[PDB]
Amino acid sequence: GKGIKKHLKRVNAPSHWMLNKMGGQYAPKTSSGPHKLLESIPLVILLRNRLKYALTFDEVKMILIQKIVKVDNKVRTDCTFPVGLMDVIHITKSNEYFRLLYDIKGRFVPHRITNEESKYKLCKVKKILLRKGRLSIAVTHDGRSIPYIHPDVKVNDTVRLDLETGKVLEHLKFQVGSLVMVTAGHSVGRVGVISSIDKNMGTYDIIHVKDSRNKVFATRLSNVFVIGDNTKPYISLPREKGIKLDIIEERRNRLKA
Amino acid sequence: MKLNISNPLNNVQKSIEIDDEKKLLPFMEKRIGNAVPGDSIGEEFTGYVFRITGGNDKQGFPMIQGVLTNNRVRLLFKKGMKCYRPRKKGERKRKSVRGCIVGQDLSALNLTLVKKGVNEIPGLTDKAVGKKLGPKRASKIRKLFNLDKSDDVRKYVIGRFIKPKIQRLVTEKRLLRKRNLLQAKEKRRLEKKQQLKEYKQLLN
């Protein structure tokens, strides 16, 4: 037959998964869920190859059996569960909270997060639908459906979704001064203020983003994520703060120690 | 030749082994389900009537009720056909089968007695075996004993000491499940109403 493929070859795995060639012939195919396979990482990899808590898949299963790891404050027990771009995974045993982010290089890194920030996740809206009764519902990057959004929320906006109540608290627009983070581009993981946008009739829309050091980089509209206004980010960025350094000064300031 | 006679009322059966062709001649050209006077087999069988209900041909190929021939045929077998066991879902197979008309080919016959005669047969109508296992549904127990909804029927289950458990009970956990569903629906409607109200209030 020709049904859905259910295996993932090790070399065919996404690059940011960052697995070794000789470490077996297969990679864990993420179960279908809230995030795309390419745009996410299974929690098996998250806490075997990143947190190093478990050194085999079986120990990953042993961890997951105890309802101790919660993705967005709800217990998850699927080994190949897609965690996705930004969300709060809380481990109760060590009482630690990680918000998943990108880095300037473009891999998925857990970021240590305090309790007050761990109940406060960001969701980039992707679609605005209206169902029966003229009730509007937002489809977010998280694969989440939020009914009864404010009318002022637009298609590309980003809402602060509270983890417990699942309700939006406030939304951020996509003006030319809005802080943004690139999610899949050549400049994945970069953070900037959106210098400008341009609308292409019937084709991809490009936006040019200004860095902290006045560095302009362009990207497609489909893979940007508003993370705040001009004032400041609404989350805590990793140690590079989303500032991608050039290949020269990166070596230069790595050398000095 | 090996007439397997069954009394379903007593749930008991007897194997009669015969060889003479004139003895079973009256059964010739009688399709399945036919009632035939079971007289010529022997003196004791005089009086009873037998319902022809199955058989197996000389090569062991069983009989059916559909194909009304006197020999073997092959045909496709469905999932719900009564002479075939599928190995996987939706699998169909073509197998030989022997027609319902009975002739001088059957290596075995299966018959049931329908009408009592005048004699008695040892072990065929003397003793009887009951259900051999009681019903499990509470409705079945309630119908068998006729005690309506007066009291729990778990005290009036038949023994093996050890009793099978009864389905479709009136357990307090069942009642709790129903009330939990009710209150879940209620609070869901309540949160719907308040969230509609807050949407209306934030519209302006």
Binding site: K52, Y53, A54, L55, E59, M62, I68, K93, S94 | -
Partner: protein, 120 residues
Amino acid sequence: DQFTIRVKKYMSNPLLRRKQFALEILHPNKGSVAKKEVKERLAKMYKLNNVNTIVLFGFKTLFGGGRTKGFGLIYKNVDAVKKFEKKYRLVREGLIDKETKAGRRASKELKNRRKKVRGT
């Protein structure tokens, strides 16, 4: 004999009730020291009253001798060892005995046992 322990990337793992680390045993001009000695060595290092809560694996003596790298785990207790660790490792440690070694004969027997061919 005289040797020294060196423990690297030591991190607590409450999720498995373990603490994970890598061990290099420096024994210059001396052969490889068996696992028992390093066992009570780190037992007194971490003030452990019991030694069977130790699992040691992946000991490589390196080129030229005098060093040996490896991995070790402590456990909260024997119950944690039994719960969170594989049976081949338990057998290697010696706290349980090996199971029946029929192997793939089970597979061939299970294929011989075709459903409703053996009434039992």
